[PDB]
């Protein structure tokens, strides 16, 4: 008998990525971009988008020839074969989801409390543990149910943020928008663009779902490209409104719910509540997509060296212990570091993943096509942004610097241990057609 997976259309895939991207940038890390970038935030989103499109150049070329739910791990194995590098990168991919869950946990709390509450290390942890555990339990009753609502939640929050843009363009303060020129603000804008690389993390949910996407050779590259452009214009369109309606120092003060307060001067409490409600569900749908679509896929891949040919995406479909591990280390990253920390580690983990993808594109450039000049250029740009991020933490928050360095080593060390015990190998079964199908 023939089994077949439920396949996603182009726009369902686009919506999925747009959802996680908006939930991670607009409603989560916006406060960290207020402090570091200031009035130069619209430029930060443009600059981060440029980095993303250079990475997209590699992803779209590779994703048009190499189809796999393994995502970037297929590209890497097609390039440098099976080894501890490839294996550590697959665990790193799983980690990218783990740390993102922490990022969403903090963002949720940042809009939950100022809606219903004090703000402290204990109250934050309570709101964080409570929302993660709810999604951990959602596997057993309603992860599929929320997953069916994801497409609607995205359309609504786009209308919510869509009114936020055009209604804000009547009450703008053009004097607060005009870009800063001072060196410390310019370098601050550049430093923020490094932490805001994660703002375009749609690469993960699309490629890890590529075999569950209709006409994947066509619709995966398209989804990645369309999805970046939508959020880039949304980011900028929102960033201008927020800064040109509230003093930036008040936004740094009210960091955790930056957009909630920024609506009050021009929409009232009807707008405040709308942005607060719109934020919670935005993050909710982003978490559901990250855990049930991303983390579950990346975990089984790192654990087994391959993925099942047939599985339900919107539940933890295999190795349930991984669900709790993903949820646990998701809290362990939200407990230690603050929003700046989590965001900094997230971008660092993503960049190393992207660096090896651009390298894979270069190794396989004869097979997949593209210009060598652009690939080499993309590699250097991403490498520089990565170093800038590491240099920033080295001097600003050295605890986060060691938090980043330990992760890459810890992931590398665990891979050595895992490959010794289990002997797990990665095979081309990730991307080679199953013969029966």
């Amino acid at each position, epitope marked *: 008998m023939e089994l077949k997976n439920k396949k996603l259309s182009l726009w369902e895939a686009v919506s999925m990525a747009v959802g996680v991207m908006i939930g991670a940038s607009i409603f989560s890390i916006f406060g960290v971009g207020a402090k570091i970038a200031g009035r130069n935030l619209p430029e930060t989103f443009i600059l981060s988008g440029i980095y993303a499109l250079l990475v997209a150049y590699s992803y779209t070329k590779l994703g048009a020839k190499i189809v796999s739910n393994a995502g970037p791990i297929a590209f890497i194995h097609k390039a440098i074969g099976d080894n501890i590098i490839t294996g550590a990168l697959s665990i790193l991919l799983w980690m990218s989801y783990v740390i993102s869950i922490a990022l969403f946990a903090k963002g949720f709390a940042g809009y939950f409390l100022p809606l219903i509450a004090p703000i402290n290390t204990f109250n934050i942890a309570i709101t964080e543990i409570g929302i993660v555990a709810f999604f951990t339990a959602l596997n057993f009753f309603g992860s599929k149910a929320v997953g069916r609502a994801e497409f609607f939640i995205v359309l609504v929050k786009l209308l919510i943020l869509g009114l936020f843009i055009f209604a804000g363009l009547i009450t703008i303060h053009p004097s607060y928008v005009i870009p800063d020129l001072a060196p410390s603000a310019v370098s601050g804008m550049i430093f923020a663009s490094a932490i805001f690389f994660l703002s375009y993390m749609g690469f993960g949910v699309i490629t890890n779902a590529s075999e569950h996407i209709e006409n994947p050779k066509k619709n995966v590259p398209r989804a990645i490209f369309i999805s970046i452009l939508i959020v880039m214009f949304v980011y900028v369109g929102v960033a201008i409104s927020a800064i040109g309606n509230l003093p930036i120092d008040e936004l740094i003060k009210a960091s955790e719910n930056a957009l909630a307060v920024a609506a009050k001067p021009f929409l009232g409490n009807l707008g405040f509540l709308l942005i607060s409600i719109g934020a919670l569900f935005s993050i909710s749908s982003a978490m559901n997509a990250t855990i049930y679509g991303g983390a579950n896929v990346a975990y089984s891949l790192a654990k087994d060296g391959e993925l099942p040919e047939f599985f339900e995406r919107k539940v933890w479909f*295999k190795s349930t212990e991984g669900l709790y591990i993903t949820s646990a280390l998701g809290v362990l990253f939200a407990l230690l570091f603050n929003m700046e920390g989590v965001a900094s580690i997230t971008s660092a983990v993503f960049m190393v993943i992207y660096l090896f993808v651009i390298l894979s594109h270069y190794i396989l450039i004869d097979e997949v096509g593209g210009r060598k000049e652009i690939v080499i250029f993309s590699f250097i740009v991403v490498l520089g942004v990565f170093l800038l991020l590491l240099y920033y933490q080295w001097i600003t928050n050295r605890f986060v610097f060691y938090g980043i360095i330990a992760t890459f080593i810890g992931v590398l060390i665990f891979e050595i241990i895992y490959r010794k015990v289990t002997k797990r190998t990665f095979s081309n079964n990730m991307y080679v057609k199953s013969l029966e199908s």
Partner: antibody
Framework: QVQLLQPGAELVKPGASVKLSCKASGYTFTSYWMYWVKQRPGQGLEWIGEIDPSDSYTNYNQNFKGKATLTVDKSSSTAFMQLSSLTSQDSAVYFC?????????????????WGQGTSVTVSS | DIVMTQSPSSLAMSVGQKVTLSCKSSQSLLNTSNQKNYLAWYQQKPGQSPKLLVYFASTRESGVPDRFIGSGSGTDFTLTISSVQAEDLSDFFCQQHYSTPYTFGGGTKLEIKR
């Protein structure tokens, strides 16, 4: 195209053991269950147990707990069934059979592709 | 364990004739959320492996003649052979694919009259 290779016959002495082999081809071995089925002459079919070839998870029919042990080898796409301390009762035809998995769902599936079965004969 | 019961024991039919084989289970094979019945039908020709005919109560396996029709739900199931052919001579086994341990019925033998 999809097939499971089983040796035709095995002769074994009472008290000894056999490792019956089931070689898969035409499909991704670790994406489907492997079931095993016992048929004695003039009798119906009895499901011995199951193995997930990806992580070696097993589940046995209570009647064969301690009698049969299921293992796989992933590289060779081969499923094995070991039968312990063989008696006259164990002489029969043993089938391996594929079964669709579909992870994270409530669907269980019957057996779509079967081996030709190994007729095991327990004799001195 | 789920007990599977088949009826009748054996039947002798000439070519073109219609027969209805029945299969009964001690427990419902209907998944309340799925709305699917986890019952399969097989054909075993003498000296051969069982061949899957029907699964989920009513879906014919690829390549199986239209003459075989499965129906029923809950505990009572049917395999209709609308026009038995010379080749159909065999044992027909039902199997619940609902719950482990998976269990088969004892079978119905079909022999051909001529």
């Amino acid at each position: 195209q999809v097939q499971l290779l089983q040796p035709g016959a095995e002769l074994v002495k009472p008290g000894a053991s056999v490792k019956l082999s089931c070689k898969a081809s035409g499909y991704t071995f670790t994406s489907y269950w492997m079931y095993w089925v016992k048929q004695r002459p003039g009798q119906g079919l009895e499901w011995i147990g199951e193995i997930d070839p990806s992580d070696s998870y097993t589940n046995y029919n209570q009647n064969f707990k301690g009698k049969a042990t299921l293992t796989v080898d992933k590289s060779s796409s081969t499923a094995f069934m070991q039968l312990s301390s063989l008696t006259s009762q164990d002489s029969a035809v043993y089938f391996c059979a594929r079964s669709p998995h579909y992870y994270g769902t409530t669907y269980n599936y019957p057996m779509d592709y079967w081996g030709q079965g190994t007729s095991v004969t327990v004799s001195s | 364990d789920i007990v599977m019961t088949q009826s009748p024991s054996s039947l002798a039919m000439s070519v073109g004739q219609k027969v209805t084989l029945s299969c009964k289970s001690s427990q419902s094979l209907l998944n309340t959320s799925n709305q699917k019945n986890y019952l399969a039908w097989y054909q075993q020709k003498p000296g051969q492996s069982p061949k899957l005919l029907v699964y989920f109560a009513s879906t014919r396996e690829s390549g199986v003649p239209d003459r075989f029709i499965g129906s029923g739900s809950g505990t009572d199931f049917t395999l209709t052979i609308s026009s038995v052919q010379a080749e159909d001579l065999s044992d027909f086994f039902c199997q619940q694919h609902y719950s482990t341990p998976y269990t088969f019925g004892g079978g119905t033998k079909l022999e051909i009259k001529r």
